[PDB]
Amino acid sequence: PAWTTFRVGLFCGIFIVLNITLVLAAVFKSIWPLIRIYRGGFLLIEFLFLLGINTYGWRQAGVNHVLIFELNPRSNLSHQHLFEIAGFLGILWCLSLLACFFAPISVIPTYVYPLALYGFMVFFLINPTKTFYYKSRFWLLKLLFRVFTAPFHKVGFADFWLADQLNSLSVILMDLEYMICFYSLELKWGICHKYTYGVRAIVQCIPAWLRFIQCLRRYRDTKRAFPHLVNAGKYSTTFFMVTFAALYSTHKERGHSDTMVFFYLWIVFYIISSCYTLIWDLKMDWGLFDKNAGENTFLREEIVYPQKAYYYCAIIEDVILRFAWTIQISITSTTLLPHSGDIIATVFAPLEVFRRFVWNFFRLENEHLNNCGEFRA
Amino acid sequence: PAWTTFRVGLFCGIFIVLNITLVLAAVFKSIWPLIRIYRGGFLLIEFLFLLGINTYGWRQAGVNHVLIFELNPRSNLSHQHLFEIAGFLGILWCLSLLACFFAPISVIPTYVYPLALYGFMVFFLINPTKTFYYKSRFWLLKLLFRVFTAPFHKVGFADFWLADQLNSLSVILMDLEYMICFYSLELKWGICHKYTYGVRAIVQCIPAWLRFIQCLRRYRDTKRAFPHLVNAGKYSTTFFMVTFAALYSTHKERGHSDTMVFFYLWIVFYIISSCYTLIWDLKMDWGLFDKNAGENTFLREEIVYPQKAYYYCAIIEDVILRFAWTIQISITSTTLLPHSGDIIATVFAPLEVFRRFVWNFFRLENEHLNNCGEFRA
C-alpha cells in the first residue's frame, strides 16, 4: 500500500539514527555478558530484514513463494511487511541497548532491559488478539509447533524451510540458554559461557536434531533412501563434530594423553562436514553444476536471476562462508579460546545469517524451477 | 508514488528521534543568541510541514489549487513532496542544532553551524542543476522575484499568496537581519537585538510593505477602490503600530513626558489593526458571516470541509490568535521588556504560523468557491 511504505520508512529512519546514537555512545559513553545477550536479538532482526529482501527477490525474479510455501494466494506478505516488522523489532532492540548503555531510570537496574526486550518480542508473537499480523503470527506459531515436534507431522515445505533457518540461527538459541543460565548466577544489586553439563552441545545441536529427524520421517513416509538418508548424513555430522570438539576440549582440560588424536579426529570430522554441506548446497539445494549447461557452464539449464555474476559470486561466497559456520559452531561449543571465543562468534554469526539469506534465494529458485524437494505433484 | 512515501517516512522518523535527542540534550547536556538564530529555520520548517497539510486538505476537500495558483495540471506537488522537503530541511536543522549543543569537532568553532545550515538551505534553493525539484524551486524563485519587486508586475494569485505568507513569517526576516547584525559583533575566539537605527522596524514591516504596494498596484490596474484600497488599509496600520511602538519605546528610554500619550495612541492603533485584520479575515478572506446561510448560520451558503465544527473552532481560533500576532510584532519591535521579549516571541511565532496555516485552508476554499480575489474570468 502507501501507509505500509510510510511505516517502513519511519521505522528504517528511526533505526538508522538510533544505530548512529548507539555507535557514538559505545565509543564515548566485563561487557561480554551484555553483548552476549543482545546478539540473539541482533541476529533475529538481521534475519527478518534479509528475509524481506528474499521475499522481494522471489516476487520479482519470477519464482512464486505462494504455491511453494502452501501460502494463501490472497492476503500475502510482500517484502514491505517484513521490512516493517523487522524495523520495529530493531527499534525495540536499539532502545533496550541504549537504556543499557545509559541509565535513564535509577531505581530500575540495568538487567531488566534485556528481560523486557525479550518479553516484548515474545508477547508480540503470542498476542492472542486479532491485531499486529494475527494471521501471520498464528501461521508462524503453528509452523513452529509442527517443527519442534518434528517426527509427528508430515513435512511440508514451510516445515523443512524453518528447520533449516533454525539450523542457521543456532546462536539465538545458544544466547537464550545462556541468558537463562545467567539469570540464576547474576547479582541483583560463572558456570555459564562454558559447557555446564553438556548443555552447550544439546542446545547447539537441537536444530540439527530437528532437521535430522525431519529427514528421517520423510524417509519413513517416502521409503526412498536417496535423498532422505544422504541428507540426514549432512546433519548427523554436526552431532559428531560438536560432541568431538567438546570431548577434545574436556580432555585438554583434564590433561589426558589422547587429546592429540581427539584433535586429529575432530579436524577430520569438521572438514568432512564442511565438504558435505558444501557439495550438498552446490549440488542439490541449489541444483547448480548440472550436466546440461552449454553457456551456463557451471549453472542450471535455465536461470531466473538475470546476471550470471550473481550465481558466480554466490558460489565462492558459500564456499568461503561454509568453512566459517562450522568453525563458529565448533568454537562456540569448545571452551578453548577464552578471548577469541564470543568475538569470533560475534563476527561470524551475522555472516552466517547472510549466507543463509543467499541460500534462501537460490534454494527457492531451484525449488520453483525443478521440484528439488519432492513436495508437490 | 511509493519511493516518495518511503522517503517521507524515513525523514519523519529521523526527525522525530532527532527531536527526542534534542530535548534530552537540552535538558541534560547567554543561550539567547543561539535560539534567536535557529528560530528562523524552525518557523520555516514548520511552515513547510503545515503547507503540506494545506495541500492535502485542498486536494481532498475538493478545492483545486492547480487552476488557482496557475500551476501546471501535470507534474504537480502533492502533500508528500512538501512533507519530504520539510522533513529534509528539518533533519538539517536538527543536525546543526545538535552540533551546536555538543561540539563534535574541536577545531571548528560553534558559530559556523548556523552559517553552514543557512548556507545549505540557500544553496538548495538556488541549485543551478536539474536536480532536487528543479522546476519547483525555479518556479518559487521567479515568484520570489516577482514579489520582492512588487509594483512592476501584474499580481497573479501566487504573488498575492506568497506576499501574505511572508506577512506571517516576519520573524524569519527579523532573524536573518539579526544574524547578519550578530556576525559583525561576535567574537571569533551588543548593538543587535535592539533597534540599531530603525532597522528593526524597516525589516519588521517590509512584508507589510510588499503586500501594501501590491494592493496599490492592483488598484492601479483595476481602478476599483473596493477592495484594493480597503485592503491597503489593513496593511498600512502595521506601519503605524510598529513605528508608534518604536517611538513610544524610544521616548520612554529618553524619559520624555509624552510617553503616556504615545502609549495611549499605540494601544489605540494596535486595537484598530487587530480589529481590522480580524474583521477582514472573517469577512473577505474567508467569506464567512454571509447574509445567506439558513442552517450555516455564521458561514457561507455551501461549505467544502465536512464538519462545521472545523469552521466554528477556526473562527474563535483566529479571534484569539490575531491578538497574539500584533502583540508579538509590537513587542519584537519595542525594546521594553528585556526578559519577556524573545520568549514571548519564541512562544507566539509558531502559533502565528499555525494561524496562517488555518487561514490558508479557508482562504483557498473561499477562493475556489466564490472568486473572492478577482483573479480570473
Q: Which residue has the cell 489593526?
A: B273
Query: Residue A69: exposed, middle, or buried by beta-carbon count in 10 A (0-12, 13-18, 19+)?
Result: middle
In whole angstroms, give the CA distance from residue B207 to residue B235.
Answer: 9
Q: Which residue has the cell 536461470?
A: A303
Residue B164 marked ligand-binding? yes
Residue type at position B294: G
Q: Are A241 and A316 contained in the same domain?
A: yes
Please check whether residue A353 is in contact with residue A50, taking contact to mean a CB–CB distance below 8 angstroms.
yes
In whole angstroms, give the CA distance from residue B91 to residue B287.
Answer: 38
Contact B9 A14 (CB under 8 A): no
Distances from the Cα of A218 to the Cαs of A153, A183, A226, A230, A280, in angstroms? 10, 39, 11, 12, 18
Q: How far is CA B324 from the centre of its chain?
A: 14
Instruction: Output the furthest CA–CA distance in chain B (Å, rounded).
Output: 70
Q: Are A361 and A303 contained in the same domain?
A: yes
b/e code A128-138 from CB counts within 10 Å (16+ = b): eeeeebeeeee
Residue B283, domain member (yes or no) = yes
Which of A121, A148, A175 represents a domain boundary (last residue)?
A148
- Cis peptide, bond prior to residue B128, ω within 30 of zero: no
CB within 8 Å of B204: residues ≥ 6 apart: B170, B174, B242, B329, B332, B333
Could you give phi then psi for residue B288, rounded to 5 degrees?
Answer: -70, -175
Count the alpha carbons within 13 Å of A1 in the hemisphere toward its beta carbon: 10
Which of A148, A172, A195 represents a domain boundary (last residue)?
A148
- Cis peptide, bond prior to residue B227, ω within 30 of zero: yes
Please check whether residue B303 is in contact with residue B309, taking contact to mean a CB–CB distance below 8 angstroms.
no
Could you give phi then psi for residue B157, rounded to 5 degrees?
Answer: -105, -35
For A13, the closest of B5, B10, B21 (CB atoms) is: B10
Q: Are A142 and A155 contained in the same domain?
A: no
Cell numbers at A169, concatenated: 540461527
b/e code B27-60 from CB counts within 10 Å (16+ = b): eeeeeebbebbbbbbbbbbbbbbbbbbbbbbbee
Residue A127, domain member (yes or no) = yes
Please check whether residue A134 is in contact with residue A128, taking contact to mean a CB–CB distance below 8 angstroms.
no
Cell numbers at B274, concatenated: 487587530
Please check whether residue B344 is in contact with residue B328, taking contact to mean a CB–CB distance below 8 angstroms.
yes
CB within 8 Å of A309: residues ≥ 6 apart: none
Q: Are A114 and A155 contained in the same domain?
A: no
Q: Which residues of B touch A8 (CB under 8 A)?
A: 6, 9
CB within 8 Å of B126: residues ≥ 6 apart: B137, B141
In whole angstroms, give the CA distance from residue A232 to residue A209.
Answer: 10
CB within 8 Å of A377: residues ≥ 6 apart: A371
**DSSP secondary structure letter of residue A152:** G
Instruction: Output the furthest CA–CA distance in chain A (Å, rounded).
Output: 70
Residue A377, domain member (yes or no) = no
b/e code B4-17 from CB counts within 10 Å (16+ = b): bbbbbbbbbbbbbb
Residue B88's SS3 state is helix
Contact A12 B10 (CB under 8 A): yes
Residue A372, domain member (yes or no) = no
**DSSP secondary structure letter of residue A284:** I
Residue type at position B220: R
Residue A375, domain member (yes or no) = no
Q: Are A298 and A335 contained in the same domain?
A: yes
Q: Are A6 and A84 contained in the same domain?
A: yes
Cell numbers at A141, concatenated: 506459531
Structure's resolution in angstroms = 3.3
Chain B residues with a Cβ under 8 Å from any Cβ in chain A? 2, 5-18, 21
Least Cα distance to B122 among B104, B144, B152 occurs for B144
In whole angstroms, give the CA distance from residue B184 to residue B12.
Answer: 36
Q: Gaps in chain B (C–N > 2.5 Å) come after which residues?
A: 29, 189
Cell numbers at A163, concatenated: 528447520
In whole angstroms, give the CA distance from residue A36 to residue A171.
Answer: 10
Cell numbers at B325, concatenated: 500576532
Residue type at position A252: K
Q: Are A232 and A324 contained in the same domain?
A: yes
Please check whether residue A150 is in contact with residue A217, taking contact to mean a CB–CB distance below 8 angstroms.
yes
A225 C-beta neighbours (distance < 10 Å), count: 9
Contact A10 B13 (CB under 8 A): yes
Residue A113, domain member (yes or no) = yes
Contact A12 B13 (CB under 8 A): yes
Cell numbers at A121, concatenated: 518480542
Contact B6 A8 (CB under 8 A): yes
Count the alpha carbons within 13 Å of A279 in the hemisphere toward its beta carbon: 9
- Rounded to 10 deg, the angle between the B170-182 and B308-333 helix axes is 30
Measured between CA atoms, the residue of chain B closest to residue A7 is B9
In whole angstroms, give the CA distance from residue B159 to residue B180.
Answer: 27
Residue B376, domain member (yes or no) = no
The count of domains in chain A is 2
In whole angstroms, give the CA distance from residue A31 to residue B102.
Answer: 26
Residue A343's SS3 state is coil
Query: Residue A159: exposed, middle, or buried by beta-carbon count in 10 A (0-12, 13-18, 19+)?
Result: buried
Residue B200 marked ligand-binding? no
b/e code A17-46 from CB counts within 10 Å (16+ = b): bbeebbeeeeeeeeeebbebbbbbbbbbbb
In whole angstroms, give the CA distance from residue B96 to residue B98.
Answer: 5
Which of A3, A4, A5 is the best residue to mutate to test the B interface, defined by the most B CB atoms within 10 Å of its own CB? A5
Q: Is the dihedral of CA B287, B289, B293, B295 positive or negative?
A: positive
In whole angstroms, give the CA distance from residue B266 to residue B263.
Answer: 5
**DSSP secondary structure letter of residue B302:** S
Contact A12 B12 (CB under 8 A): no
Cell numbers at A343, concatenated: 568475538
Cell numbers at B258, concatenated: 509624552
Please check whether residue B363 is in contact with residue B56, taking contact to mean a CB–CB distance below 8 angstroms.
no
Residue type at position A114: P
Contact A9 B10 (CB under 8 A): yes
Quote the Cα angle for A182-A185-A190, to 5°: 85
Q: Are A241 and A338 contained in the same domain?
A: yes
Contact B8 A9 (CB under 8 A): yes
Which of A110, A133, A148 represents a domain boundary (last residue)?
A148
Measured between CA atoms, the residue of chain A closest to residue B13 is A10
Cell numbers at B308, concatenated: 462545521
The secondary structure element, H or E, covering residue B345 is helix B344-370
Least Cα distance to A246 among A195, A193, A296, A297 occurs for A195
- Domain span at A226: 151-366
Please check whether residue B181 is in contact with residue B192, taking contact to mean a CB–CB distance below 8 angstroms.
yes
Q: Are A193 and A108 contained in the same domain?
A: no
In whole angstroms, give the CA distance from residue B154 to residue B283.
Answer: 25
Residues in chain A: 377
Count the alpha carbons within 13 Å of A24 in the hemisphere toward its beta carbon: 9
Experimental method: cryo-EM
Residue B235 marked ligand-binding? yes
In whole angstroms, give the CA distance from residue A18 to residue B168.
Answer: 36
HEC readout, A9-54: HHHHHHHHHHHHHHHHHHHCCCCHHHHCCHHHHHHHHHHHHHHHHH
Q: Which residue has the cell 564442511?
A: A274
Q: Gaps in chain A (C–N > 2.5 Å) come after which residues?
A: 29, 189
In whole angstroms, give the CA distance from residue B165 to residue B144.
Answer: 12
Please check whether residue B222 is in contact with residue B374, taking contact to mean a CB–CB distance below 8 angstroms.
yes
In whole angstroms, give the CA distance from residue A371 to residue A375.
Answer: 7
Could you give phi then psi for residue A187, rounded to 5 degrees?
Answer: -130, 105
B325 C-beta neighbours (distance < 10 Å), count: 22
Query: Residue B346: exposed, middle, or buried by beta-carbon count in 10 A (0-12, 13-18, 19+)?
Result: middle
CB within 8 Å of A152: residues ≥ 6 apart: none
R_g of chain B computed on alpha carbons: 22
Cell numbers at B338, concatenated: 528585556
Q: Are A91 and A14 contained in the same domain?
A: yes
Residue B355 marked ligand-binding? yes
Least Cα distance to A137 among A184, A206, A79, A81 occurs for A81
For B11, the closest of A11, A13, A18 (CB atoms) is: A13
B302 C-beta neighbours (distance < 10 Å), count: 9
In whole angstroms, give the CA distance from residue A230 to residue A227.
Answer: 5
In whole angstroms, give the CA distance from residue A113 to residue A374.
Answer: 45
In whole angstroms, give the CA distance from residue B354 to residue B349.
Answer: 9
Q: Are A231 and A176 contained in the same domain?
A: yes
Residue type at position B360: N
Cell numbers at B246, concatenated: 518604536
Chain A residues with a Cβ under 8 Å from any Cβ in chain B? 2, 5-18, 21
Residue B375, domain member (yes or no) = no
In whole angstroms, give the CA distance from residue A92 to residue A288.
Answer: 40
b/e code A196-208 from CB counts within 10 Å (16+ = b): eeebbbebbbbbb
Q: Are A10 and A115 contained in the same domain?
A: yes
DSSP alpha helices (H): ranges in A149-198?
158-168, 170-182
A144 C-beta neighbours (distance < 10 Å), count: 14
CB within 8 Å of B115: residues ≥ 6 apart: B183
Distance from CA of B29 to the nearest CA of A (A): 13
In whole angstroms, give the CA distance from residue A258 to residue A260.
Answer: 5
**DSSP secondary structure letter of residue B151:** G
Contact A2 B2 (CB under 8 A): yes
